Design a protein around this ligand. Structure first.
Ligand SMILES: */C=C/C1=C(C)C(=O)N/C1=C\C1=NC(=C\c2[nH]c(/C=C3\NC(=O)C(C=C)=C3C)c(C)c2CCC(=O)O)/C(CCC(=O)O)=C1C
Ligand SMILES: */C=C/C1=C(C)C(=O)N/C1=C\C1=NC(=C\c2[nH]c(/C=C3\NC(=O)C(C=C)=C3C)c(C)c2CCC(=O)O)/C(CCC(=O)O)=C1C
Ligand SMILES: [Ca+2]
Ligand SMILES: [Ca+2]
Lengths: 480, 480
């Protein structure tokens, strides 16, 4: 039920601006928000063509519409409004918000450069995330700005925070995946910005609900004024945030994380400042992606050093196994190939244990257990006792493993020990008030000792595992 | 209820191919269709990395993935399969279908050119639509190929047909809008091709239903194997079509119409031929768009001739009204300005009727009726008796009108007479079996005399109306 609410078609906006939908062919009015007259100062009925008398920007909007610039922005000094628009099929969606008076563009510009200089010097990611949080905190004026990093399961945890003391500190807390369900996360991957200036706004309808040009209700995916999900607003109330504002951090086409801003009372942010925060997220995205590519490449080539050095040792060795484990350096490398603390090479009934392993009998019983599983190439887990409760007995030495079959009945398995982590959750991760699934009322810190879990296997490490398997597969077939 | 079924996320495919979803980072298997083993000849469990041993194309797919070509196609001669793929966020969606043996590429090429030569010579649209239907009929082998033109209300009517006698002829029939509801039409605007080789296929699931990479169910919007809506399949059964295939005709970013193919028994079409039919639709789209731009421009400049000639006549005239109506030629032009058969100029209580109008009293009572309506610029209708039953009394002379206010209490109204059209519908347009809305069982021709309706006003004509209003607005303000 959770991810099925279509958040992109509510047929309504928030109060802090108004909305006009017009037909590209002729710029005739097709839909409007009920509050449009309160901003524009002219009705514009359905069917009405836009003219320079009522929309002074109409001349530049036509120009914008033919061009390539995906969005339109225009300062309407007359009415102190910021106007913006975008294309949606054959429609232009105009949004009008009150202009943010008393803000400086040199302020933004100067502040943005202080981050861009910082970000381009190759600094530690932690400090990049903090000062990015702290600029958005500076220029936005919220009570809390934080940076929320998604994990592989789409739970996320707070990795940076700036604030004014007025709201709680969530630095280092994990939050469960359902807090930002999948349709929200997909929307946020393509529309990278959102603002909710007042949690208790009364939704302002868009009439007619069905657009007469398309036959459908309006796709509000790129509407910055879109009315948000009712259930999320209970989340905000439950949290005690009267205003929020968030910006997607998109790295390599994927939603990496969020800059999340919250205020204790209501709060608004100008179109300009919101455009500035998107800029900040964009720079940080570039930092993150390069930090990843460089850490990966340097790890891949470091594993390459080890890989070939074992590859030549096995080839040059008489019995071959002695390339993997002939003396100090070969064993050392076998464990460093995949960043392991021990390993078991099993050639039928000949067991060889290197480094810190479980017992010969424990490994026997693991292999039997593995044999029943259907594994294509390699089996990796950071939590062996999840799928094999039995292995809770040797969690200190083999919480995580990579296992590689070799014959039909040999095996090569690496071991990683338990790392004890205390994870702090923003409220109980499992709790939801069932009825429609409603949000939990408490975000008090909820502790959880994490047991039987190793450091996770990096993708270079699994790649080296699969690589090393091939060389071994090709030698036992050759030897026989 | 009708347009809310999310047709793009059924978690299942049709039987005529299989599907594999893999993760772009590593090409690891994330989802598969239950029939994948029946096509690939290797299981590939969830977590399995793709290698050259099981997917020979993996080398070229990696190459494709980095590049700009939005789709991937590859001939897998070994297994007689056509493989294709596309990008979906951070995922590659591979689809495998049996290759169409016994077809010629020179056949397609030669046939496609015979349309392209035809289409580039500026022929009448009717003949372009027919021979486009007839090529798709030729190369696809269905029992009926037709071209379906959407109207402004998203009902559509058949404007070309080629066939083998084995199915009914629908040439000239209208079909109601709900036959292709809005979410289907929006999907077809971006995914321009679809094939349903057998109406009674048993859906083949995609497991796991929730993708572990994204956290969401698979967005199958660009999946050529996607399982179609159950309700549409009742439509096909009700119609007596065992196979179908359709191609969007997209002009200026909008769904203009469909090439719709249907077979009496099951039928399939190769990836190549389907790519060929999309090509044909693409050429025809270009024809249509140029036919429109040229008919419009030539009509706009023809209305310009009249516009300025009246504009100079009004300026040069002493009482001004005599520019609109001083002698033969001025009246002639007043009616030709907007392609009308009569008009009423009303300056307070001074009524002037030109050409074929309703009675002075009828026009009085229309103006009073108009005054109560809230009109920004001009009011146009092709069906005056719809909103003003009273006007059914003078439908022969004023079924359609454009009315333009001028003072506060003058008016300029044009009139168009009733055109009697017998419209043929493919079954009763209003009928749907309520329960979930199910499709009607009869597509027998359903006749409807269309009364009280004029030839519709073209957008150049309304533009000239609004234009002529401005000149008149600016003169009565000047005269006073
Ligand atoms: C299944 C319904 C939902 C439950 C239960 C739930 O807890 N959230 C549910 C739905 C939605 N959440 C949406 C937006 C959203 N959620 C968050 C979450 C956080 N805010 C925080 O401060 C923290 C922790 C630091 C988290 C994890 C955010 C940031 C957002 C985005 C909006 C914002 O900036 O506040 C959401 C979508 C709303 C919409 O866009 O309409 C839904 C449906
Ligand atoms: C509200 C549910 C629907 C009713 C009622 C209904 O009549 N159709 C309903 C839904 C869908 N129709 C879908 C596809 C579709 N419909 C047509 C219609 C025609 N086929 C014809 O031969 C003619 C007339 C000449 C018409 C008007 C077409 C062409 C299609 C496209 C598929 C095809 O090529 O047959 C549809 C979508 C199915 C999907 O893509 O999953 C729905 C949901
Ligand atoms: Ca992460
Ligand atoms: Ca049309």
């Amino acid at each position: 039920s959770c991810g099925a609410e279509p958040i992109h078609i509510p047929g309504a906006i928030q109060e802090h601006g108004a909305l006009l939908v017009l037909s590209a062919r002729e710029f005739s009015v097709v839909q409007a928000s009920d509050n449009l007259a309160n901003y524009i100062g002219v009705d514009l009925p359905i069917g009405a063509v836009a003219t320079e008398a009522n929309l002074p920007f109409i001349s530049v909007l036509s120009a914008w519409y033919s061009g390539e610039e995906s969005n339109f922005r225009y300062a309407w000094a007359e009415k102190k409004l910021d106007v913006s628009a975008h294309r949606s099929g054959t429609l232009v969606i105009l949004e009008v918000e009150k202009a943010g008076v008393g803000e400086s563009a040199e302020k933004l510009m100067g502040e943005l450069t202080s981050l861009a200089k910082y970000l381009n010097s190759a600094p530690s990611l932690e400090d990049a995330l903090f000062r990015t949080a702290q600029l958005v905190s500076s220029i936005s004026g919220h009570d809390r700005t934080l940076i929320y990093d998604f994990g592989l399961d789409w739970s996320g945890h707070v990795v940076a925070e700036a604030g004014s003391g007025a709201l709680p500190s969530y630095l280092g807390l994990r939050f469960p995946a359902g807090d930002i369900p999948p349709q929200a996360r997909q929307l946020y991957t393509i529309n990278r910005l959102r603002m909710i200036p007042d949690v208790d706004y009364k939704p302002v309808p868009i009439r007619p609900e069905v657009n007469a040009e398309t036959g459908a209700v309006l796709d509000m995916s790129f509407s910055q004024l879109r009315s948000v999900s009712p259930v999320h607003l209970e989340y905000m109330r439950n949290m005690g945030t009267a205003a929020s504002m968030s910006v997607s951090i998109v790295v390599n086409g994927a939603l990496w994380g969020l800059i999340a801003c919250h205020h204790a009372t209501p709060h608004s942010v100008s179109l300009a400042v919101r455009e500035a925060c998107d800029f900040a997220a964009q720079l940080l995205s570039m930092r993150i992606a390069m930090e990843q590519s460089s850490q990966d490449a340097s790890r891949r080539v470091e594993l390459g050093h080890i890989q070939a050095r074992l590859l030549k040792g096995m080839a040059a060795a008489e019995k071959w196994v002695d390339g993997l484990l002939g003396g100090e350096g070969e064993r050392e490398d076998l464990l460093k190939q995949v960043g392991a603390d021990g390993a078991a090479l099993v050639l039928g009934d000949d067991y060889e244990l290197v480094g810190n392993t479980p017992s010969r009998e424990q490994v026997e019983e693991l292999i039997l257990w593995l044999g029943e599983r259907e594994i294509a190439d390699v089996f990796a887990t950071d939590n062996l006792a999840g799928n094999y409760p039995t292995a809770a007995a040797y969690a200190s030495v083999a919480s995580g493993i990579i296992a590689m079959r070799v014959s039909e009945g040999s095996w090569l398995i690496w071991f990683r020990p338990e790392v004890i982590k205390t994870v702090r959750w923003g409220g109980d991760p499992h709790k939801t008030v069932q009825e429609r699934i409603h949000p939990r009322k408490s975000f008090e810190i909820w502790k959880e000792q994490l047991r039987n879990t190793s450091f996770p296997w990096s993708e270079p490490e699994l790649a080296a595992a699969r690589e090393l398997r091939g060389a071994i597969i090709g030698i036992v077939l050759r030897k026989t």
